[PDB]
Design an enzyme around this catalytic site. Structure first.
Site, mmCIF file in Angstrom:
data_model
loop_
_atom_site.group_PDB
_atom_site.id
_atom_site.type_symbol
_atom_site.label_atom_id
_atom_site.label_comp_id
_atom_site.label_asym_id
_atom_site.label_seq_id
_atom_site.Cartn_x
_atom_site.Cartn_y
_atom_site.Cartn_z
ATOM 1 N N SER A 53 0.814 -1.215 0.000
ATOM 2 C CA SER A 53 0.000 0.000 0.000
ATOM 3 C C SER A 53 0.850 1.268 0.000
ATOM 4 C CB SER A 53 -0.948 0.004 1.197
ATOM 5 O OG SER A 53 -2.034 0.887 0.974
ATOM 6 N N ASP A 109 -10.308 -3.126 -5.525
ATOM 7 C CA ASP A 109 -9.467 -2.177 -4.801
ATOM 8 C C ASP A 109 -9.438 -0.841 -5.524
ATOM 9 O OD1 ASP A 109 -7.431 -0.651 -3.615
ATOM 10 O OD2 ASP A 109 -5.904 -2.249 -3.725
ATOM 11 N N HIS A 141 -8.057 -4.916 -0.939
ATOM 12 C CA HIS A 141 -6.948 -4.265 -0.259
ATOM 13 C C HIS A 141 -6.959 -4.574 1.232
ATOM 14 C CE1 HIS A 141 -4.033 -0.739 -0.437
ATOM 15 N NE2 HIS A 141 -4.141 -0.946 0.866
#
Lengths: 325, 324
Positions: free
Chosen positions: B162, B259, B289
């Site tokens: 991320s 996502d 995610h």
């Protein structure tokens, strides 16, 4: 987004410069063989394998030809068996076109790859090849046969590319219907799963990406001439119901971003997930269909094989515990 | 096509959720930590590892805390180093939230994972964390340091999820600008690469998939308050030119199907391909995610770690290849 192909796959896409649909299948096959033998890179970096040609004789006197490859120096070792079904639209393809892929898989997985030389169309139609492949898996899973070729039937997996991915999928459904629990994993590399030639990926990649819509139509017309028969789930497993697909073997479904078959492969993976199966589905970016039936192996093709091997290794670990052994 | 989530990710997505954007970051962090500790499963089936805590003294007098994990019985073996940057939108995340992921990577790759506890926002802003992460890589690559923790700096790879994916990416770019050749690979797990909150995946997965568009806006607000700075390629590497992205380290880019960041991650992979790099970009279907910052690891999370490990082993083999 606009597709950005990797260099190798771009090269292949532009290299495809001859219409196979204009020729008879025997001519196409001979040209294919020549394109492998005459490629100057075809042998470069090719792994060494122990190769055995094996005939299994059915009840009436008919034969299935198997090509079995294993790593060198595994003579007294029992290996996991990978039963492999090659692509080629059910019409072309051979141990030669897939030699690169098969030899690499063999030494990277340290497995016995059992290559089924199934009968090609149109000389036979659906479902002859399917029945040969099922018969081959059934033969390998049998204890005394597995001892005879030094493989461990508790780790049997089926794997195949394109039309061979179709064959892998439907051999799994078929073995389920016969109440067999002999396949422990299925690897589907950009499989054919349906006959809708107007999915979005079919529209977007209909031309200039090596596998074309035209070619898919030609393949289907040789394999299943009468269109109604295409409604069998053993032809187009995407048409199967969720209940038809329950309790199938642990699955790895790999799709290509720039491929007419992309959408149906991914939809088949979604159906397998709905049906409660153990399913890993991945789309590789920047690649086209056909990287596993050539004289050489693209860099991404190699990454993909390393991935498949990691997944196979996890599959076999799962088996080993709770023990068999 | 309509997205089909896998059961674990479906359950995560459906869960009772509190608007974190309504609370101060410090409260969010303590609540986050609590969410890991009170899970009875946070510790069950956790790999046993050798752990060492190391402090880096940076040139400007601030410190970086490093948490280094390696497999048991590897005290005196030289291992490949993975420098790891955790996610959490540059505002949250910790050695605790990623403990599960890091320990599994550690014993599966049989590597020394060097976890950088970089300074979080808003207490600091961009680019303080980036500078810390770069200093950490330079530190590991330094031969006496590498010898002191028994790692082989010829195999250094960076990895991150991320915002930690963001950091990995940009750290590579920064290292390139400084003429450094010390990173042999980058693993970008559904990375943040841009600030367009209106891509197709942002629109389609804006709500109800754990990571929300709201949350991303909140993150960017704490990390880079002055919007001019968002134009830096070191904030949003998707904005870099193709020439800028040339000769970066061998890359593995992993995106999730459901996502908001899916499109920019894949766009960044395409740019890396355009720039002539060695890039593997894969989209995993049926997941969301955030599977790598939880008490447990989803089945797909486990498959993905096996994928990464295979890719890393190939990376380490390629680097050592000419020694023959």
């Amino acid at each position: 987004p606009t597709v950005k192909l990797k260099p190798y796959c771009q090269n292949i896409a532009d290299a495809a410069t001859i219409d196979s649909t204009q020729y008879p299948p025997e001519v196409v096959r001979k040209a294919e063989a020549a394109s492998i033998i005459d490629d100057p890179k075809a042998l470069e970096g090719l792994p060494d394998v122990y190769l055995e040609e094996k005939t299994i004789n059915r009840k009436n006197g008919s034969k299935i030809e198997l090509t079995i490859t294993r790593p060198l120096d595994t003579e007294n070792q029992v290996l996991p068996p990978i039963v492999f079904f090659h692509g080629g639209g059910w019409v072309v393809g051979s141990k030669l076109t897939h030699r690169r892929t098969v030899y690499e898989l063999t030494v990277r997985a340290r497995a016995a790859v059992i290559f089924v030389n199934y009968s090609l169309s149109p000389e036979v139609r659906f479902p002859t090849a399917l029945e040969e492949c099922l018969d081959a898996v059934v033969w390998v899973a049998k204890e005394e046969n597995a001892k005879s070729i030094n493989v461990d039937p508790t780790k049997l997996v089926v794997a195949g590319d394109s039309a061979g991915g179709n064959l892998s999928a439907v051999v799994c459904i078929r073995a389920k219907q016969l109440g067999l629990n002999i396949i422990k994993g299925q690897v589907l590399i950009y499989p054919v799963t349906d006959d809708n030639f107007e999915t979005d990926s079919y529209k977007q990649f209909a031309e200039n990406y090596y596998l074309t819509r035209k070619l898919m139509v030609w393949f289907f017309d040789h394999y299943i001439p009468d269109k109604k028969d295409r409604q069998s789930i053993f032809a187009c497993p995407l048409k199967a119901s969720i209940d038809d697909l329950r309790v199938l073997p642990r699955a790895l479904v790999i799709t290509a971003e720039a491929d007419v078959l992309r959408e149906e492969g991914e939809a088949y993976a979604r159906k397998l997930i709905e049906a409660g199966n153990d399913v890993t589905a991945v789309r590789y970016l920047g690649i086209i269909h056909g990287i596993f039936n050539l004289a050489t192996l693209s860099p991404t093709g190699s990454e993909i094989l390393d991935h498949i091997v990691a997944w196979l290794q996890k599959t076999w670990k799962l088996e080993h515990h709770h023990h068999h052994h």
